[PDB]
Design an enzyme around this catalytic site. Structure first.
Site, PDB file in Angstrom:
ATOM      1  N   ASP A  65      12.883 -11.449   0.712  1.00 16.01           N
ATOM      2  CA  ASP A  65      12.118 -10.656   1.714  1.00 16.01           C
ATOM      3  C   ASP A  65      12.662  -9.235   1.800  1.00 16.01           C
ATOM      4  O   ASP A  65      13.853  -9.008   1.575  1.00 16.01           O
ATOM      5  CB  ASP A  65      12.186 -11.309   3.093  1.00 16.01           C
ATOM      6  N   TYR A  67      14.207  -5.798   3.326  1.00 12.51           N
ATOM      7  CA  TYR A  67      15.246  -5.415   4.317  1.00 12.51           C
ATOM      8  C   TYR A  67      14.566  -5.359   5.682  1.00 12.51           C
ATOM      9  O   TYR A  67      13.549  -4.687   5.811  1.00 12.51           O
ATOM     10  CB  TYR A  67      15.849  -4.054   3.958  1.00 12.51           C
ATOM     11  N   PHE A  78      15.718  -4.405  -2.875  1.00 15.66           N
ATOM     12  CA  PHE A  78      17.170  -4.053  -2.751  1.00 15.66           C
ATOM     13  C   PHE A  78      17.394  -2.533  -2.698  1.00 15.66           C
ATOM     14  O   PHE A  78      18.512  -2.093  -2.281  1.00 15.66           O
ATOM     15  CB  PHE A  78      17.983  -4.741  -3.850  1.00 15.66           C
ATOM     16  N   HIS A 188      22.106 -15.723  -3.656  1.00 14.35           N
ATOM     17  CA  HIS A 188      21.636 -14.389  -3.190  1.00 14.35           C
ATOM     18  C   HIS A 188      22.842 -13.481  -2.964  1.00 14.35           C
ATOM     19  O   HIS A 188      23.856 -13.926  -2.443  1.00 14.35           O
ATOM     20  CB  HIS A 188      20.798 -14.540  -1.904  1.00 14.35           C
TER      21      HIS A 188
HETATM   22  O1  LIG Z   1      18.113  -7.783   1.827  1.00 12.75           O
HETATM   23  C1  LIG Z   1      17.216  -7.944   1.019  1.00 12.75           C
HETATM   24  C2  LIG Z   1      16.316  -6.823   0.602  1.00 12.75           C
HETATM   25  C3  LIG Z   1      15.326  -7.115  -0.480  1.00 12.75           C
HETATM   26  O2  LIG Z   1      14.609  -6.257  -0.950  1.00 12.75           O
HETATM   27  N1  LIG Z   1      15.271  -8.393  -0.948  1.00 12.75           N
HETATM   28  C4  LIG Z   1      15.989  -9.458  -0.458  1.00 12.75           C
HETATM   29  O3  LIG Z   1      15.712 -10.602  -0.760  1.00 12.75           O
HETATM   30  N2  LIG Z   1      17.005  -9.158   0.424  1.00 12.75           N
END
Ligand SMILES: O=C1CC(=O)NC(=O)N1
Length: 224
Positions: A65, A67, A78, A188
């Site tokens: 997902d 941020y 990310f 993750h």
């Molecule tokens: O903290 C995050 C940011 C993102 O883009 N994707 C993730 O799964 N974790």
């Protein structure tokens, strides 16, 4: 507003099977603003990973997902804007594994646009979130769209390395079993998961070996 006006032509042809699902998400996101519930990223950045050529994707990175903190999510998994400090904890961890693996200096900022320009698709399974409420847009219908996108990259008759970060590895490995595709997983890079298998996973130089293996060019992972 037909996909062709939101994403790159290749992607739009790849995502025609889910063009309705995409429109429905726009109605959902509109209803969310109307109800005083903003979402992230910005509407113009929601489909940004699909703004780089469908036919140039060599490495697919799949997160969970966006941020949840305002100022962070930019629609590339990310990534954060060039001036953002401190970095989000997922990105700091990624960058440490980056210097461990590749031996390059700590990057200057968290802008991952160079990777996107070099055929790394920075994908999240779910492409919006309610601010300060992590994973809040799970089950809202993004999953169908990202699955069609992943399925379409796999059927593409070109080398692909998939990097599956987090809880979506076992769901996404099956969509990615094909002679021209290799899926590598780790926990993750988030602080709670990262210590039990993300650190030491050396995914960047693994990805490259698998590419050189498949006769395709390695990624240049170097960030300023
Ligand atoms: O903290 C995050 C940011 C993102 O883009 N994707 C993730 O799964 N974790």
């Amino acid at each position: 507003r037909p996909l062709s006006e939101l994403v790159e032509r290749g992607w739009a042809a790849a995502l025609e099977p889910v063009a309705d699902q995409v429109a429905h998400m726009g109605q959902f996101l509109r209803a969310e603003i109307a109800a005083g519930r903003r979402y992230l990223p910005a509407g113009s950045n929601v489909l940004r990973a699909f703004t780089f050529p469908f036919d140039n994707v060599r490495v697919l990175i799949v997160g969970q997902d966006p941020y949840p903190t305002p100022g962070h999510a930019v629609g590339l998994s990310f990534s954060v804007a060039p001036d953002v400090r401190p970095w989000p904890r997922s990105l700091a961890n990624i960058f440490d594994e980056y210097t461990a693996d590749l031996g390059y200096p700590l990057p200057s900022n968290g802008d991952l646009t160079p990777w996107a320009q070099r055929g790394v698709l920075l994908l999240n399974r779910v492409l919006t979130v309610r601010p300060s409420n992590p994973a809040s847009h799970r089950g809202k219908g993004w999953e169908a769209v990202t699955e069609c996108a992943i399925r379409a990259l796999a059927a593409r008759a070109a080398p692909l390395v998939a990097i599956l970060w987090g809880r979506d590895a076992s769901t996404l490995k099956p969509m990615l079993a094909a002679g021209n595709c290799v899926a590598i997983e780790s926990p993750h890079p988030s602080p709670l998961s990262a210590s039990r298998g993300f650190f030491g996973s050396r995914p960047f130089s693994r990805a490259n070996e698998l590419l050189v293996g498949m006769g395709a060019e390695p990624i240049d992972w170097r960030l300023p």
